[model samples]
Target: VKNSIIWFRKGLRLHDNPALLEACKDAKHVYPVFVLDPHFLQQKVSVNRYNFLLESLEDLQRSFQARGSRLLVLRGKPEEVFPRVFREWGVTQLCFEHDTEPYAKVRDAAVRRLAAEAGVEVVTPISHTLYDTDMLVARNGGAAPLTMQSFTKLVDRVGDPPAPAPDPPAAMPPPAEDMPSAAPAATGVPTWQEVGFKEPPLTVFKGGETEALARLEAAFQDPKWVAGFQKPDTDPSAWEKPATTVLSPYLKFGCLSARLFHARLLEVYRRHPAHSQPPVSLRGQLLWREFFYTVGSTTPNFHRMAGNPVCKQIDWDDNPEFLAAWREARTGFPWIDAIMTQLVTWGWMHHLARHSVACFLTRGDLYVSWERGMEVFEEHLIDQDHYLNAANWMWLSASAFFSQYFRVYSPVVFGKKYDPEGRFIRKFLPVLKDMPAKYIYEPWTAPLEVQRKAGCVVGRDYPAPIVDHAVASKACIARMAAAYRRS
Candidate 1:
């Protein structure tokens, strides 16, 4: 009778989970485990994301209960927790989804050696990503695919990603009868306040496999929407609900299976033959994520500009004032502020909205380092993955992945194009709610009488435009050109 430990990390769901299935394979007792490592707690994590995690864990717990099993919640570093569990519960087999990030790799390696010392057989499966990234990189001549074209070509050569596995059985293997009785009391899920966070004022998402599955189902119901989906075509200004699929947070937390989503998408494409194609399509969006993961896995300093081989070195400004304004949603540019406001409040925003703000912060107006922008996203975004967040900042700032620094988003013009009436702006930045359409985007430019008519003074009511876009943008562009010349 084998005693297995299915250690849960990012792959928080049961459906199509390879590690969970492997743990239950021919085992009499399977202990589902989650360790709350203090390393994550110490970081500037978003309370909203943490709340989502706790909710997901509660959902997982319920799922485990329905299966005649239980999740053994543990707190401490993995190295310390595993040894105690192995000694107490007599863990024979250890199974987990492989985590490819720099920090996770080191942590997992240490835990793997511990399992070895305890004579525990290990099964580390690849499931968090659509395909095995290490192998994908190896197939591409042992180099990371830097471009989406090269990435798509590599993916084509390797064939489609493997099919998702089935869920665990209805009646899962029970825990050992002699299990420590006092364990549940000590190792239980902590509340938001307990974790040192006030509950979020607005939770736009419910994080769990149950919620993920429902959202996935709802998305596929509109086969036309799924088939013809092009991320670039999606309106970033649609704030009533997201214009694009909001499955990213679920994918980030592994509440939804990427493989399962891919398979479902293929089914939709099979039905609608006239669907949009890659590099901008729904499938392309997922592949974009894969592209970052592939590059991030093998590249050193993928998250930072300094010492990063792929990232171009840039002399970004050290303006704390500018960075704070951009982050705090008081940039005085309603378009930029509204996007930042949406991000801070909802912990998620449209992809193009992110691009707009990233451009504004780095190459557009403020001229702050992309690293500083990445930090804000890392702390605020519900779907923030280190690889994606850092990679995107580099791309947007023309530090790496994308190098067309000449193209920049106008904080005022860009938003006006999407939402000429400033409806989306008013939704997030209610201070500009009554401002006339003519001056909605650039309220400071309005005549004093007009500002008074709206009862909102440009500098007094909201804020004056932080920097003159015309002057600062040209200056930033000159600096960027100089940097390129030096490089």
Candidate 2:
């Protein structure tokens, strides 16, 4: 009987598991492994993302053990780790899911080269994305469609997405009995401290395939919300019950299968036909993710703003202090501060909330590099997907994949438009909890007597507005227009 290894990457779920099923065929012993690449740990990603990962791994481990199999936890680079395992376990072949993030492509290629040198076969099937991203590129004549309209047009020519693979094998073929474990033994999935991060102060969101399925079930129950779901109308300020399904982190981590998610959504929408259509609908939300995946797969410099043929080069300000204030949420703008505070503390933000903050950081006011803003999102989000982070920053900054450079989100008006009562601001910036609604968004303009009464004096209890909004808006508009003309 042949022995094989199923490498677990972003496709964490056993349901709709393509790699696992393929690995089980004609194999008596299948070693399921998850590599904890040391390089990933050193990055500035938040504790919340790590915490969720650890929780997900523990759940995965339990699932494997339930079927009399074990998850072979590996550490170090794939090139180094897999070769050693192949030799020791007498591994015949390797199988894993495909992913499009640039680093993943490079990493997988290196692993494939190493596997070939060791006489191990590799079978990789696309599972992370809805349509094969390469196929999407091919349909568009070798270039990934840069806009959603272009992308949807290509998809129209192509057929509908493939159905998700069936359930996990009831029994996983066990590890080879003669194979001795490697030394400096498998530490299994890591704790926050193990990987050099403090435990997140709070983990309101749990991770795991089990929890992901539950969320899917709960989401489907809200037929009305599903039918009427519009990305633009979502209340980014709502805390306890966010208007949209807060499922991106789960999707990013692969605790949930994107295919299963899209399939279920389609089924729901077939019944609830009144739902808003794609580009803004619940289904459209998934398509947005697909859009970025295709973008990342095709664009070589998708992560960088400079020398990225698609990204418009702009003369951004060299103001470190301005950048820092925006980051630390002491920007003295109550709406900006509140959103930034929520982001750092929780490691997630609503799409519109992200829009407002990214706008303020890059084009709306600060005119900082979208690259700088991308770095911050890369570090802060639990759902900090590589492609999504890059594409979104570019979109928000009006750098690439979007052409609305002239249009800007107002820091003061945008937040107030969604949450007129200042409730969201009060939640994150409790210092302004008692401030009157009329003056909450622009507390600096509040009468001195009102500030004293609210017990939140501008520039003292709360920081004063860093830049005059009126002045900054005009300056930013001029700079962007100049950049547009130059680019």
Candidate 3:
């Protein structure tokens, strides 16, 4: 009988899985495999992301079992493992979804070459993105998308994607004849310990298709979902509310297809036809994801340098202490510190928080590089995508792609504007709970007597502000102005 292997990468679920569906249709028997590449895991990634990935794989395994197929777990390089499996099972074809990240693109190229050499047909379908990268490039005349506005307008013109295919039926290949007695023993799924992690608390966002669907259901069905999207950034207390469809983690893991997400949003919009203009803000964010992907795909090294060639020469400080303070959330700036704490605790942060904190790192600290901040983000962000993360950092740093270049975010002023009354700060920094509402944003400004009365001291009880906002703001603006003019 004809046999094939479906190599599961990030696309973990059954619904909207084109590769899996194709494998089932063409091959008499199909085997599903998930390889844990040690190279990626051993990188300087965060434990939070590792836990999220583990949860996603665990959920995917259970989903496969429900379909009467076991997910064959392998731990090694794909080049070494896949060939061995192919020879053992007499597999003639391999199928998997495509990814656009630099390492993933390179890895896929190697796998495709190996498959060709082994005389196996390898097919890859675009499963992660809303518009296929190829289609997007074609529409944009092969020019890279530099701004989200232009890309969004172009995408809107092209319109929404077709509805995703239904979940594929559970089907499996017969047990291999003389299944190698020495068939690589499943090392069993690795725990946090196996990966050298001291298990942390339960993550705020869990992974898997089940959770994805539940989040989607809750976002659309609940009244808060609409209300939350309408003003996700307006209410600091709305931080924990299910306002934004927390579908980012799912999207990151391929537990949910972007196509399905787009279709569902459209469905909700039509069903609820708002009396006033419906909040399409959530939809706009999704399009932003697509826009970043298009940029990354075209520039390829967009992450390495700013989109504007001239901004690459900007002078930056390499203050280890400043970077440490920013990284550890000990900057003594409640707004910045609170945001960092939220990211560490929840594996997620609000969009405004991301922008504000990022700006603080680049502008306030002034010694840190956007690249360094991006690395920190990659380690901690559960919903981290290479394109979106890199693009957003570049934007905030005023280093690339339509940035105003002189607009600096004053952390103190930002805290007052976006998170007035320090509610967000209190949520994450319970140590500062006793600080009066006015002092929440700038506790250093409080008199010594008031500070004692509030039961807080800036340097001892909490962190002292790493840099003075007013001084840092003026310096940062001057430096950025010089850099912009020089560029």
Candidate 4:
């Protein structure tokens, strides 16, 4: 019987998993493996993300167990582990989901070389994204589409992605009985503490295919909600009940299938023929994700302003103090601070909330580089993707994808429009809970008497606005224009 190995990476689900299906197709003995790389294990990543990963792995393991298979949670690097497995287990085939990140590209290439040396056949199927990002780039005349219009046109030319594949059959493909004994014992999924992170606080967002599938079903229950979903119109401040579908983390971890998501949306659009259109619709959000994935895979230096072909070079300030203030949720702008608070505590935030903080860090007020802001989001975000995080940071900072440096988001005005009563602020930043609606967005402006009544002082109780928004924004706009001229 043929021996096959399925290396589970981002694509963690059983349903619609092309790689997993391929691994089991012609092999009677299929071993599922997840490599716990020291690179990520040692990084200063947030505990929340690690917790989510652990939960997703546990779910994947349970699914495999139900189908008469075992998931080997192996340690050490893939390059080191695969070679030993190839020889000791006499592996004939290897299958894994395709990844588009720069690091993944190099890592997978190294593994593929090792597979070739071992005389092992390799199969990689694209499932992390709706379409193969490289194919999208090739279709665009060997260049990624720089604008939404061009991207939409390219997508139109390619047509819809293939439908999701079926799950592996029950009571099939048992792992080899005499597996390599040197392999790390499956101790079950590790707890957050076991992985060197404090047990995360209870959060609305949970990891795993079980939760992801349920969230998708709940989101589509209302046909109008699905049909009329507009990214721009969603309320960023609705944290208690987020206005938009909070399925991003699942998509990021591949706990949810993008193809399945697109198919369900198509079903909704069919029922409600007058639904919203792309670049802003629900499917538009997914397309935006696809657009970034396409560009991020092929573009050189897609993450930074230095050598990035698309990002505009800007001379930003080196203000560690300002950057720290933004990171620690002490920006003194209630809207910005509240959003930061939500990010650190919940490890998630609305897309518009992210815009407010990213704008504040770069072209809006702080005058810091977009690179620093991108790093913070990378550390704390549960749904952070290599492509989407950097792309949106550049877009918000006016470094790339967008150039309206003058159109700055007023931290005070923007949030007030969404929530005039400051209830959202009250929930996230309870120190400002008692402050009046008029002064909640700008508590420092309140008189001493009013501050006393509210039970929180601006400078003492909360914090004064970190920088004068009016002065800092004007300086930033002028600097941006100067930098644009130099470029």
Best by lDDT: 1
Model 3 agreement with the true structure over 1-487: per-residue lDDT tens digits? 6688888888888889989887887566677888886666555667788888888778877876677666676778887888788878777889999888888888899888888888888888887888787787788887856666677767777777767977887555533544662143562456666767776744688878889988877776754355335534544334767335668888988988888887876766665655113224667777778877887777746777645342355677787887888889998888888888877777787676787788888854454788888888888888888888888888788777645756666677776875577777888899888888878888998988888887788777876777777788788778877887885
Give lDDT: candidate 2, residue 29: 85
| lDDT of model 3 at position 339 | 81
lDDT score for residue 261 of model 3 = 80
lDDT digits (tens) for residues 116-190 of candidate 1: 999999999999999999899889888887889988999999998999999799998877875673167766777
Question: Which is the better candidate, 1 or 3, if ranked by lDDT?
Answer: 1
TM per candidate comes to 0.97, 0.96, 0.92, 0.97
Model 3 steric clash pairs: 317-367
The CA lDDT at 231 in model 3 is 37
* RMSD to the hidden true structure, all candidates: 1.4, 1.8, 2.7, 1.5
lDDT of 3 at 94: 90
Candidate lDDT values, in order: 0.88, 0.84, 0.75, 0.88
Off by over 4 Å in 2: 38-43, 182-185
lDDT string for model 4 (323-391, tens) is 999999998999999999888888899999999999999998999999999899998899989899999
Question: Candidate 3, 140: how far from true, in Å?
Answer: 2.1
Determine the backbone clash count of candidate 1: 0
| lDDT score for residue 300 of model 4 | 89
Candidate 4: give the clashing pairs: none
Q: Among all windows of ten consecutive residues in candidate 2, which has the lowest summed lDDT?
A: 178-187
lDDT of 2 by residue, 174-273 (tens): 8866465632256367777877775654647888889889988988887888888888988888887877788988899898988898888878878876
